[model samples]
Target: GMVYVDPDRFDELVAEALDGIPEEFARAMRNVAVFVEDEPDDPELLGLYVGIPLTERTTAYGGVLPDRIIIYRNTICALCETESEVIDEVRKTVVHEIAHHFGIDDERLHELGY
Candidate 1:
């Protein structure tokens, strides 16, 4: 409904960013599904369950489990006004979630170039 990033290109951007992930790690993160969507549901509630909260944010890892990275295409696109900016932000978002897979917490994520 909003003038968000095109779904097709959103998929492409996520794929491109994921492609950069090291295969060794990617394989172990198999069950993890990365999706590019328009928005978050009741975003504020996300904070009650995670660190990144809602919007274009990553949820915290609580225990041993598969990760689900949701990229808000319109939100991210709105935050960054250029293709390169979008790419960079997507890459950052992917890596941030990947960090959760490695048991990294929010503070650690920031220290790790998140």
Candidate 2:
């Protein structure tokens, strides 16, 4: 039952996934901004990995743009060859992005919880 997502659907997918987050945790997301790009060039990708290792971070953040979350669509999509694959990857991206907004570093995100 997969809806053919829009070219820019990746970001919206992130928003939907974030909604299921607990209220207490979700509240911290206020005033946050989000952007979806077709791709993130090298510098941008490298910057994301600087302070918070991607492996440790469930989310990626730009502190100067404290309110914004950039979701790279192609990067997430590349791993998928099917609708289900894309859906699952996007959901994982959403969790990772939300983790950034809430300041949950990758190391902690790596731990298992609900």
Candidate 3:
């Protein structure tokens, strides 16, 4: 069964996930924005990273839109049976997507247990 959390609380969880990142990594993050949505058209999709990875950017990479990392609240909740599970999932999803921004692929991410 899906676990349900208040929308405001969900947002706070996302924020907490961001805060969990190490300070050095957080400071190094470039133009990127994080968003929370109910779900993607593909309900199984927990999150999405829409932007060029940092490793792929060059000096020419400028005047471009901020990269977007979207966390699907409902999708995440659907996979959890308790609030603590939701919290853990949120952190995992956030870290997974942010790793993409740093140019880490799924293979490595999964291997690293993200």
Against the true structure, whose TM-score is highest?
3
Query: For model 2, what is the C-alpha lDDT against the true structure?
Result: 0.55
Q: Give lDDT tens digits, candidate 1, residues 17-57.
A: 77766554566456566766676675421111133324434
Candidate 3 has an lDDT of: 0.77
TM-score of 3: 0.71
Model 3, stretches more than 4 Å misplaced? 23-28, 52-65, 110-113
What C-alpha lDDT do the candidate models reach, one value each?
Answer: 0.62, 0.55, 0.77
Off by over 4 Å in 1: 1-4, 22-28, 43-67
Q: Give the per-residue lDDT digits (tens) of candidate 2, residues 51-107.
A: 334454444664333355566666656666765566565555555666765678778
The predicted structure with the larger TM-score, 1 or 2, is: 1
Question: What is candidate 2's CA lDDT for residue 84?
Answer: 58
Pairs clashing within candidate 3 = none
Please give the ranking of all candidate structures by lDDT, highest first, separated by commas. Answer: 3, 1, 2
